[PDB]
């Protein structure tokens, strides 16, 4: 087609607002202020092809997984209406963050104004996924201790809202602060160490291991840490500049660690609801 013809450009001729990683040298999209050209670039080979397809395939995966969860029979749930709500809040954060991300990566090359707008949606999305992750996971760990459950959901929301407001800062999006963005969102997720230690103290090592929690969360902690470490230090494109332009650069694998980490997270809290269904809502444990 003869409409909106464009070629990939090297990194040195890019405008300022499009230089986010100088280790990717060739294969960038040039600035094109047409959404039509941006959305058809999804089927073109460039630096953002993997970044969009990873979180667009992941967005429909958790969308369909989220609707199957709503139509599962209430036969298997101790409180089907509010159990499907806490899970839906996790699915709400998961879908919004993956949709904000692939949309941002698609319209990244449109203009400076559109780029800054969808970048703030991109950063706010990951906070929503972190807060949404905490809701079904807390409502089960503190099932019989309601007041620790309700303070810990207040502070993760005051932290996630603060993380969303700090993402409205413009120097947040600069490449000089890529280590600052790494620690802010990583400290958001690793803030759960305080509710986890509270849970182990009151329930015990055996309880935490029998129910399977300490195994699934150190998987979560590893995916959290490894994903943030690759992003902040730009491995492997830091080692091979100019050979990871299209496939397997840091941002691409970080996207994969988010889809896998959110699915691993769903697997853990879904186990916590099958374990609750077997012992019921009654509570005389002490």
């Amino acid at each position, epitope marked *: 087609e003869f409409e909106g013809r464009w070629r990939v450009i090297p990194h040195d001729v890019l405008p300022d607002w499009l230089k986010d990683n100088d280790f990717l040298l060739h294969g960038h999209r040039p600035p*094109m202020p047409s959404f039509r050209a941006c959305f058809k670039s999804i089927f073109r080979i460039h630096t953002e092809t993997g970044n969009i397809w990873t979180h667009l395939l992941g967005c429909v995966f958790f969308l369909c997984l989220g609707i199957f969860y709503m139509f599962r029979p209430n036969i298997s749930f101790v409180a089907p209406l509010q159990e499907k709500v806490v899970f839906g809040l996790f699915f709400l954060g998961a879908i919004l963050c993956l949709s904000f991300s692939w949309l941002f990566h698609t319209v990244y090359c449109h203009s400076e104004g559109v780029s800054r707008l969808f970048s703030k949606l991109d950063y706010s999305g990951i906070a929503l996924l972190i807060m949404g992750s905490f809701v079904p996971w807390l409502y089960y760990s503190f099932y019989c201790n309601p007041q620790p459950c309700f303070i810990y959901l207040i502070v993760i929301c005051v932290l996630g809202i603060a993380a969303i407001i700090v993402s409205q800062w413009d120097m947040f999006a600069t490449p000089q602060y890529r280590g600052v963005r790494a620690g802010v969102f990583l400290g958001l997720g690793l803030s759960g160490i305080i509710p986890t230690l509270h849970y182990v103290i009151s329930e015990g090592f055996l309880k935490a291991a029998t129910i399977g929690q300490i195994g699934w969360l150190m998987l979560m902690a590893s995916l959290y840490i490894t994903g943030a470490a690759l992003y902040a230090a730009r491995i492997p494109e830091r080692f091979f500049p100019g050979k990871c332009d299209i496939w397997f650069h840091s941002h691409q694998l970080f996207h994969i660690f988010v889809v896998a980490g959110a699915f691993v997270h769903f697997h853990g809290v879904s186990n916590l609801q099958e374990f609750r269904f077997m012992i019921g809502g009654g509570c005389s444990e002490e």
Partner: antibody
Amino acid sequence: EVLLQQSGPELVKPGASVRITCKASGYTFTDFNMDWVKQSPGKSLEWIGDFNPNSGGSIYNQKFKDKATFTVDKSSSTAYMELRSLTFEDTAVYYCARETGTAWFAYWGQGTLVTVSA
Amino acid sequence: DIQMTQSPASLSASVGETVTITCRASGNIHNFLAWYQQKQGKSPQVLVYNAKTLADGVPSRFSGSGSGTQYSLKINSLQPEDFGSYYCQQFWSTPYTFGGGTKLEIN
């Protein structure tokens, strides 16, 4: 700095041929597309076509399909344009102009004046 | 083919004044527009590309705007060196096309 230097003025007779050479330097030649622009005296600019040094393909304006032919020599980073069977209508200043992803022209040659006269 | 209609064809203004060169495309060009300035006998130089992005080294008094089929080039506080011809260009559809041009004279 990126510079586009093309050949000097040509004085030819009707029915003859000319080849204008645009020599580019200051960048990797295959990375960007080269376009050609015609400007008749006192008139505005007209788009002749675009040439891609990487693939070697070219897209011609229908008006200049039977008039222009784009060639290239990647060893010397030179673009060429052949004009065939020239008439008095082909008296103009011909430019080369380099794209940068999309076909907006940041760099231009100084221009080659082609004068047809018997 | 997309037709580009530039207006006015020519105009003369004093130094320090503001001038506006309008331009209309026969079809939607999706902001794939560029403006150029050409001095007497010299080569044209790009002023604004992508409808609004100011090119490197171009003074801030030049500003491009518009969307769809109606675009505009504005020159605030005219300087003596601003005389010459001005052209618009669309690069959304092939064959790419230029406007008729606008001759600017300073008094």
